[PDB]
Ligand binder design. Structure first.
Ligand SMILES: CN(CCOc1ccc(C[C@H](Nc2ccccc2C(=O)c2ccccc2)C(=O)O)cc1)c1ccccn1
Ligand SMILES: CN(CCOc1ccc(C[C@H](Nc2ccccc2C(=O)c2ccccc2)C(=O)O)cc1)c1ccccn1
Lengths: 274, 274
């Protein structure tokens, strides 16, 4: 490999995406890692029902039912907390996408479709940044909720987070940093096979350039990590499977859980998804 | 890039896989392409219900219902023909997999799981070899059935082939040959994320070597095809979506079609799939 104007353009694209990533996502992997080990945040640990209640400042929730079984109340509060986070993350990701060169010039309907299918895949990708073996950072790093506490929630609420943790353990072993992730998340957004796209070629033309930039970024940033580009591309399949499973759980809740409606933005995203 | 003992080993692996591919799959892409343009096969074209009946030698079927509406009879005969082909293709692919170096040494349960999830993905990959814009080769190249005839079958039978054709048009535009496909299909079989695998690392260790071989094969065989490795890896996601859709259609048939049971081998493959 040589350092030439083609490669320098690919590095400039990588930097542009990194800079927009920093602007769009306040809690980066670097910041999260600093917390999980050295920082200005000292998160309160939620590891059981008591500590979920003794630290109610972290979880946002409201319209809270005094008279119901504790196991149910706790599950519904956690679910509302994830719903609040998801709506905020959608706004971060849509802001980021606007900085992807060429994206805002695509047909508006395709921009919508690309974000409709991309956003949850990116949410779960970036959630791994906030996860370790023990648990997940929440509330902009002010809390840390354990994996085993989340697994212990009343059926079926206890099934929601475990597939994201399983993904994160293997994904975090790739040791990606924010500079890598900024490009990877752009590659996900510019996926030409989303249902109902109108003009695939302008999308794939952008994606191909992002793939070139990602390939170079990994070579430079990960010496001796064999086939990291291919291993990372294959993670895009895992993300779709996580979405599929998550949708099926959300429906179980809809079917057997009154007094729970999705935020209208999430409803819009999920309506006619696949 | 240099020609050295590491690269020569990767070419030797590519050749080993090609040789086994030739031994396992009698109707290769090269042979199919020769037919679709120059060959010893002159397929009969099935383009409408009459020609489906005027050329009943091609389609295997049996236990054939005289007294029923023609649109239904034709659909059930086509469905039985695909079922016969599928059972034969499963046997070809399982034979091939045994030649993948290291595969037969994996735990037997994981060998089963890898083939359980791999086989239909490989069937649809290789079906594209037999497809052009107009239709698909059948009965070892003795027939050619049009895409529009298959789309015209009685609802819901008319929905089955169209997603495979859509995949094939875009996949065939990558211009892969049999030497490329032999390695790609091995990469699919050695996917470490299949449900219920016991030892993932020995699988991913084989897959990583296959990916190295595939990457080199594409560089050598496809000058100026930009990002072909990444574009091809992303096709593995499409294949899973085809399987998902196909399963959902098979169930529609099961629900609203008496006197149709799957061949027991396909039943085994589909049982507890996902
Ligand atoms: C676990 N965690 C980190 C953020 O996790 C996310 C986990 C998932 C999501 C995506 C989001 N999920 C939900 C949306 C609406 C309602 C429930 C969920 C759940 O996901 C859920 C359901 C039942 C039980 C548990 C969770 C979506 O689909 O948009 C967004 C964020 C928390 C927990 C408490 C407070 C804040 N942070
Ligand atoms: C179209 N074609 C090429 C082979 O195509 C395949 C298309 C699909 C398959 C996979 C296979 N499919 C079936 C299995 C059982 C019953 C029906 C199907 C159909 O796929 C089907 C159903 C309804 C209507 C039409 C098809 C599987 O799941 O194992 C294997 C082969 C034909 C057609 C007639 C005879 C032979 N070749």
């Amino acid at each position: 490999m040589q350092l030439n104007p083609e490669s320098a353009d690919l590095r400039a694209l990588a930097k542009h995406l990194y800079d927009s990533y920093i602007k769009s996502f306040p809690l980066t992997k670097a910041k999260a890692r600093a917390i999980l080990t050295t920082t200005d945040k000292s998160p309160f640990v939620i590891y059981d029902m008591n500590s979920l209640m003794m630290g109610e400042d972290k979880i946002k929730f409201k319209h809270i039912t005094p008279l119901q079984e504790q196991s149910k109340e706790v599950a519904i509060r956690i679910s509302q907390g994830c719903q609040f986070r998801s709506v905020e993350a959608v706004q971060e990701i849509t802001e980021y996408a606007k900085s992807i060169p060429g994206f805002v010039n695509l047909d508006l309907n395709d921009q919508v479709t690309l974000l409709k299918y991309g956003v949850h895949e990116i949410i779960y990708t970036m959630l791994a940044s906030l996860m370790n073996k023990d648990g997940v950072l929440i509330s902009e790093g002010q809390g840390f909720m354990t994996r085993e506490f989340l697994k212990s929630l009343r059926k079926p609420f206890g099934d929601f987070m475990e597939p994201k943790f399983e993904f994160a353990v293997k994904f975090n072993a790739l040791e990606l940093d924010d500079s890598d992730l900024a490009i990877f998340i752009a590659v996900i957004i510019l996926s030409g096979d989303r249902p109902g796209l109108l003009n695939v070629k302008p999308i794939e033309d952008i994606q191909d350039n992002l793939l070139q930039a990602l390939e170079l970024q990994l070579k430079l940033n990960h010496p001796e990590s064999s086939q990291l580009f291919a291993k990372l591309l294959q993670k895009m399949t895992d993300l779709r499977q996580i979405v599929t499973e998550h949708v099926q759980l959300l429906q179980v809740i809809k079917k057997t859980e009154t007094d729970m409606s999705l935020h209208p933005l999430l409803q819009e995203i999920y309506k006619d998804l696949y």
